[PDB]
Write a protein that binds this ligand. Sequence first.
Ligand SMILES: CCCCCCCCN[C@@H]1C=C(CO)[C@H](O)[C@H](O)[C@H]1O
Ligand code: NA
Ligand code: NA
Ligand code: NA
Ligand code: NA
Length: 540
Amino acid sequence: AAPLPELLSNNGKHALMVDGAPYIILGSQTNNSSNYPDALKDVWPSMEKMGANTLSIPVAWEQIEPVEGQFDFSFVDVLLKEARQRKVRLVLLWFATWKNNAPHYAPAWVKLDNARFPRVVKEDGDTLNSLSPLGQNTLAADKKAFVELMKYLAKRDKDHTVIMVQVQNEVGTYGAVRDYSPMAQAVFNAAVPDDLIQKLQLKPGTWSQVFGRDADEFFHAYQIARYCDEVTVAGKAIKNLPMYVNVALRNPFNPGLPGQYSSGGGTDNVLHIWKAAAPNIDLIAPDIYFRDYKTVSKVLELYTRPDNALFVAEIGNDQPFARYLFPTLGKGGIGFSPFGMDDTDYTNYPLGAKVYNDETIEQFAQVYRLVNPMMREWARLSYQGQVWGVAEPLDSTTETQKIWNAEATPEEKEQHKKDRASALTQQLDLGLWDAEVTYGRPMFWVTPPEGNTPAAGGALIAQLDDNEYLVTAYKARVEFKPSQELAGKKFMIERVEEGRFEKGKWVMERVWNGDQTDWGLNFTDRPHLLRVKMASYSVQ
Ligand SMILES: CCCCCCCCN[C@@H]1C=C(CO)[C@H](O)[C@H](O)[C@H]1O
Ligand code: NA
Ligand code: NA
Ligand code: NA
Ligand code: NA
């Protein structure tokens, strides 16, 4: 009976609707070789420990169509049944024409037949192991198999255990900007399509005439976007699930050249091409492995747009990455999915954690525990209302940084401490009230913040009414104050309640008061959900 999942976009805000209401993916993604029945026993325990509500896991073209026309959905059958037993949802990752630029997950009868299914050809005439998006047989074959997967879900997944499908994995090309095959050159050395000229409001011409120095890259992005949109449309005609693409990000400050980064993917410079070329693709999701706050923050800014719901489709599984949940949700993100959350004997350090163990999982579990108890209420407030979210904005002190700290004078030291306390103090404008969020200080008195070791804190705030906020935070202090001068009036906290939602209704457990509200609202590693009511009052 259940309504299809759907991505809603209204008033520049977004919701992923699941079972007729907004939903947050508190996700985990498997390692790349866990897409088989025998591997699932090494996936579920981690998902339970993490408290994730949705599993991202590959479905590979090589596994469903190992011999052309001979489909095998045995893996999908087991996965659906085992996910349902655990009352979790699924995001299937279609690994097909591209997985990290390459056709490794395409069947042997595809990836070993270059004449039928041709590769990118560099300007110098050398071939790269990246399938050309101008290969018409490759598009037809990928589309046919994707359709068979969507028919399987149409017939066998009536309650939508699968809520979303990723189409390909990190498309593009390493080692060239585009295809320079004779086939590609005939399409490049030709008019830009009318649709793209109309949607970007440009003057007609050839790719080189219209886009100049960007022609090669924008050509590759356009042709890959068109390919992915055709696969998406074909699959949606069977079952209209949300579908998205995930991006091998370029560094947003210092990207280098296309082909150094994965050329033609949804990088920040070609989001306009992708949105014009692929209007059937619901969102373009960043895959985040930059560890440093400023770069991560910049990625979250670039990918959150009126035309783009924010979904952190991948993030590293090392400790520093967990706190990015908070800004992701504060931007109205629909989900967050740390990569490599299984015990299949693999670690992707230097991208992720050096060691996979219960402590690795616990860093994410601890932040998920703040959101799970309010997931549906948060998702509704994010979409229909005003939310905020912050993370601790200094990264952990370096080996290098401690050396520079050790060699500093006592004036340079006390100055560094004032500077760190300032950087670890964030202001949020909540309308009539502001919050100040600080990191790494006692739960009593006003010693300045010194940060957590390692960096780890954050906060979420949702506005319930002009003077009332839902607040939860982690290894941080949150303090409220008036946003504007009060002309003679004083202010206080009126009431802080800790509680929970039962059947969508607020249940109070206790009132925070006294020491618990005199020095801000102090959070450790334990979950507390608060409703904070502020008041200004006359003394005249
Ligand atoms: C900050 C430097 C990051 C360089 C990484 C760029 C490519 C990331 N690709 C993703 C990351 C992993 C995690 O191991 C897997 O290969 C995923 O399948 C891939 O989508
Ligand atoms: Na949202
Ligand atoms: Na204000
Ligand atoms: Na203000
Ligand atoms: Na509680």
